[PDB]
Amino acid sequence: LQHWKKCDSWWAKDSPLETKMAVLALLAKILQIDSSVSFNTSHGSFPEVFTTYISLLADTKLDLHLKGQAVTLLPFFTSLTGGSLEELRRVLEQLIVAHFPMQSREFPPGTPRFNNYVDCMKKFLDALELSQSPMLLELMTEVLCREQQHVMEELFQSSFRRIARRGSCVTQVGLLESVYEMFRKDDPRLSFTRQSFVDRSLLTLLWHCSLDALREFFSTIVVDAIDVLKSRFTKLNESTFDTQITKKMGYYKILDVMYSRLPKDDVHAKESKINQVFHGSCITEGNELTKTLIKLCYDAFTENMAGENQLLERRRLYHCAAYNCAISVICCVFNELKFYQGFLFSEKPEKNLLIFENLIDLKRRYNFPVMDELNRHECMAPLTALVKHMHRSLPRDLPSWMKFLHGKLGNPIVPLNIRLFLAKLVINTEEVFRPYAKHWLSPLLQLAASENNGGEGIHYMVVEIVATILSWTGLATPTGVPKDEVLANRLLNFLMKHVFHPKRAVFRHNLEIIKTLVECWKDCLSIPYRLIFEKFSGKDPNSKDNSVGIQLLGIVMANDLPPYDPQCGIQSSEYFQALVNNMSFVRYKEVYAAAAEVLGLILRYVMERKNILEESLCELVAKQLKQHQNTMEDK
C-alpha cells in the first residue's frame, strides 16, 4: 500500500482493460488481508486513492464489468468515512441510474444485458454484506422498491436476512434507523414504493434483528408512530391521502411485528420500559398504556365502509393490517381467553370480518403445478396462529361468534367469498377444532350444499370441505337429523353428478371421494339411482361415456350392497336390461370388463339377500353372454 502512488500508471484511461481489472483485484486482495488497520481512517493520503475510485466508477469508456469489479470497493471506503460519503452518493447514484432500468421484465433471462444487471446486483449485495453500510443499505432499498417481484427478489431477501444476523448492536440499530427514515420522510414518492420499503426490506429486517436490539427501534420510533396513528384520517379531498394511509400502513406493519419477538415482561410488567406513550416520568409502575394502541386499533378495525369510495382496496388492505396488529397485541399482552376475545372477535352489527375481504374476486380453485395456494390471501396466517394458540391456551363462544357469522349469516347477507374465507379458516384449523365438531358439521356441510360454491365442478374447495366432514365423521358421526338428511342428499346428488373428469386419475380421486363419502357415513343416504341409470345408459358403440356410470354403480355396490330399484323413476326390467346391454360394447376394455364386474357383484347381493329379481337378471345376463358366446369367444 505504501508505495502505491506509482499506481497512477494503472487505472489509466490509456491502460488496456485487462490491467484495469487486474489492479482492482490486487486492491481487493490487499483490502482483505489488511483488516483496515491503516489507509482507512487517518493514516495515508486517502484523497488520492478515493478520488481515483471516484473517477473510476465515474467512467463512461469502461464496460459494465469494470464497474462490476469496481463495486467491490464499497466493503471498504465505507468504514469511518466521516463525511465525503456524498461523493459516493453522486457517483453511485449516477451509476445506478445509468445502468439499472427500472422495469426489468422486458429483458429475458439469458439476455447479456440481463446478465450484466444481475451481476451488478449481486456485486452490490456482496458489498452490502461485507459493508453493513447504512448508505449502501438504503441505496439497495431504493433499487428494490420500485415495483414488486422484478429482480428475482429471493436473493435480495436472503441477503437482507443475512445482514441483520451479524454486527454490533449499535450497528443494527443504525441500520434500522436508516431503513426507517425513507418510510417517513415527507418527500412525495410513489405510495406503492413506500409500502414496498417496509414490506420487502424493513419488515424482514426487523424480523431478523438480534435479540434485545428491537427495543432500541421500538423506543426510537414509538412516540412519532403513535402520534401519526392518532388522527388525520380526516382529509380525503386529495388522492394524496393515499400517502397518509400508506404511512399508517407501514407503521402498523412494524409495530405489530415489534409486539412479536418481544418478551411479555418487556411490553408489559410492573416495570414499564415502554412507558413512553405518556411522558413516562410518573408512569413507571406498571404498563397499561401500551395497550392504548389497541384502543386506537378499534376505529379502523370496524370502519363502516363508504358508499362510493375511491381507495376501496387500499382501505381494505389497511384494515387488514390493523387487524393483524390487533391479533399480535392480543396474543402478546392479554392472557385470559375471555381477553383473547378482548376485542379480537367482539363484533358490532357494524362488523369486522365483513370488511376484511373483497367481494368481487372470482377467486377460483385449482389442480395445478408445484399450504399456500390461495391461503396467500391476507390475514390468514395470523388467524391460524390465533386459533392454534388459544387452543393451546385452555373458548366455545369464540367459535360461537364465527359460526354465527357462518350459519346465522348462512343467509346470503354475507357474500360467498366471506363464507369461503371463514371455511378456509376452518379448513386449515381442522386439528384445532377436532373436538368441537358435532355442532359444526351442518353449517360446514351447508356450505358445499349451496348451489353456489366458488365456480363449477369439484372445486378444491369442495374437496377440502368434504375432507373436513369425512375426517370428522369417525368420531363426530353427524348422520341423520332433519337438516343433515336434506343437506347430505344434496351433497351426494351434486357429487355423483360431476364425478367425471377429463383427467386420468383426477376422476379416480373423485371416485374415491364418493367411496369414502358413502361408506364412512352410510345412513339415510338415498343413492340417486336415476342419476346412475343416465350415467350408464349410453347406447353408443365406441364411447367412453358408459364407463362412468359403470364405476359409480360399482361404488354404490361395493360399499354395502344396498337395494337397487326403490321406485327410482325407472322400472327394474329396462333398468338392468340397459345395464347388462353394456357388455355388448367390446370396443373398450374398461367398458365391458367393468360392466361384468359390477354385474357379478350385483348377483352376489341379490343371492345372499335372496330377493326375487335374481331370476330375471340371471336370465338377462345369460342371454347377452350367449349372444357373445357363439360369436366372439375371446371376449
Binding site: 384502543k295 378499534y298 381477553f339 378482548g342
Partner: peptide, 7 residues
C-alpha cells in the same frame, strides 16, 4: 366498550 380493553 373501553372496559374490555381496560380490564
Amino acid at each position: 366498550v373501553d372496559d374490555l380493553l381496560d380490564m
